[PDB]
Amino acid sequence: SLLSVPHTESVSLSTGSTVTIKGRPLVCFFNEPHLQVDFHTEMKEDSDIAFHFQVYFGNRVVMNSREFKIWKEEVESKNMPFQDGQEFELSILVLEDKYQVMVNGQAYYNFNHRIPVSSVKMVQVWRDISLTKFNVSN
Template identity: 65%
Template structure:
């Protein structure tokens, strides 16, 4: 019997098709036997707290009630306020060992005679007596005084003005047993003997020509 050309080609192709079909079946079986990592990952995500995959800022947005516990004007320390406007006033309770730190920058060049004024009031209003009046005439002098029964007393004048034109400053007023001690940028510069008891101070006011960064009170 003679076999045609087409039949010969068919006999040649059949083994090849058989091999391809076997490979396909084997791959399907192997894929079914592999663990489903996607399913495991899905299960892991479902069982893991969602906050572990998120930044602190995102977590804070998810729990708005927590923001109520944080004041936007508050910086490190329970008695430190970030200040956005001048004049700035805040109630205080001072005693020996207390410290008031004021950070800011003059808003005008020294040629325009900017000033910084800090007052320790004995009541929570601007008309009250002032136990310590600290006033800086940038580039010129520093005046310290007190106001008692509505009248200014003898002022103390100092020509040492370690502030720099256009640069930020750090003024720290420490309450000592007999006096207020003032440091500027870490340098002890001024002292003012107590005329009224430090415990009588009820309010601190900061004003004049400055951009105020923060006012911190440490007791």
């Protein structure tokens, strides 16, 4: 069963929360499908983003925050555990000091908190993926 994409949900996070996302890129890596996960401070889609996670499948990952409507310092990663043509499971763990992004059960990306975790109220998952699971831990 495919979930709506763009996928937008109300959330509440604290230390120990996990946001789990299972999906599949819509096309082969050769054509560079993208994935974007944005942790927003309000349900409104122009609200600030505590954690922006953008995957250029087969290429690289970009992370950032948008604070008072301004994009801040971009961080890059060349870690690329994602597998061409395959379903992936993202688990974004909310640690005290950072978000930690696991791909298939191992941590590959980290982003220290710039906006307090308690300010996050919405998550949006979008770009070139299908989605079968979006779960926030209880």
